Design a protein around this nucleic acid. Structure first.
Length: 225
RNA sequence: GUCGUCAGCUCGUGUCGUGAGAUGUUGGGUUAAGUCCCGCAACGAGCGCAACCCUUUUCCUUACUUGCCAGCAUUUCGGAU
């Protein structure tokens, strides 16, 4: 399931953002700049990626939980497919404030969505008229769109996998508050302070995030115990 | 009585602040209305608004007197009989 770095170079993980937006805390991984943008050297990318894959493998083996989080328009469908075929919950859409630190109140909306799914399997809408059916379907739509990811999961996940740490900084803070480890993809214009396993690489490239999430899903599938 | 039939007034978990506090309740449209929809460290609730009450506008059922008179008959031409 390892990438070696053939595929990383092919996908384009080395590319980064412009030199005027960089965070001075990535100087170790900056390596150099071919043009006005930075180029992270994959020499540092591959070992951290391998360790992240091994850690995901070990958690999958001991049955511990990892949540998936990527909310960018580029990575939304990618994490959709990968979390679906890896059988883990996900946050494809916006992170809700306090989803982890205030899980008790979110369980109520989780139960509401699950009960509404049971009602959808039921037939009460046949007795009700078309209008109230149209609304109840639209609350169905909004709650599924917001928190349809985490309905199956019943507790705090034992780890987080973050596509863009700068975009999902709130989830990073909540995970730090509750002690949950985080493995995340970090680019040049990002802060790696609060991430336990810092893998540096590009996040804008759809093919690169596809590679990362496919590697993660393959690791969890290959846990197989 | 009045502001004034003005549209607002609050509470519980979670975050920020040493703190009193803030957030939610803000921002974009819309409405008679904190009425409804989006985004958004917020996630949820109560009293307010609206509806439930009375009256008016169309039709149906039940009811046929002290109220009614389309058809029939008698009329002093008055449903008078």
């Amino acid at each position: 399931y390892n990438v070696s770095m053939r595929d990383l170079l092919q996908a384009g993980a080395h590319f980064g953002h412009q030199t005027r937006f960089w965070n001075p805390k990535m100087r170790q991984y900056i390596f150099g700049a071919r043009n006005k943008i930075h180029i992270i050297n994959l020499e540092h990318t591959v070992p951290a990626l391998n360790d992240a894959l091994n850690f995901a493998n070990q958690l999958a083996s001991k049955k511990n939980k990892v949540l998936f989080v990527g909310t960018k328009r580029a990575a939304s469908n990618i994490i959709r497919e990968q979390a679906q075929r890896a059988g883990q919950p996900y946050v494809d859409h916006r992170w809700l404030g306090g989803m982890l630190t205030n899980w008790k109140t979110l369980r109520q909306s989780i139960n509401r969505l699950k009960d509404l799914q049971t009602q959808s399997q039921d037939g009460t809408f046949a007795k009700l008229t078309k209008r109230e059916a149209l609304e109840r379907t639209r609350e169905m739509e909004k709650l599924e769109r917001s928190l349809g990811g985490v309905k199956n999961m019943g507790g705090l996940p034992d780890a987080l996998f973050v596509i863009d740490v700068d975009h999902e900084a709130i989830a990073i803070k909540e995970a730090k508050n509750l002690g949950i480890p985080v493995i995340g993809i970090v680019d040049t214009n990002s802060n790696p302070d609060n991430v336990d396993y810092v893998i540096p690489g590009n996040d804008d490239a759809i093919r690169a995030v596809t590679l990362y999430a496919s590697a993660m899903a393959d690791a969890i599938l290959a846990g197989k115990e």
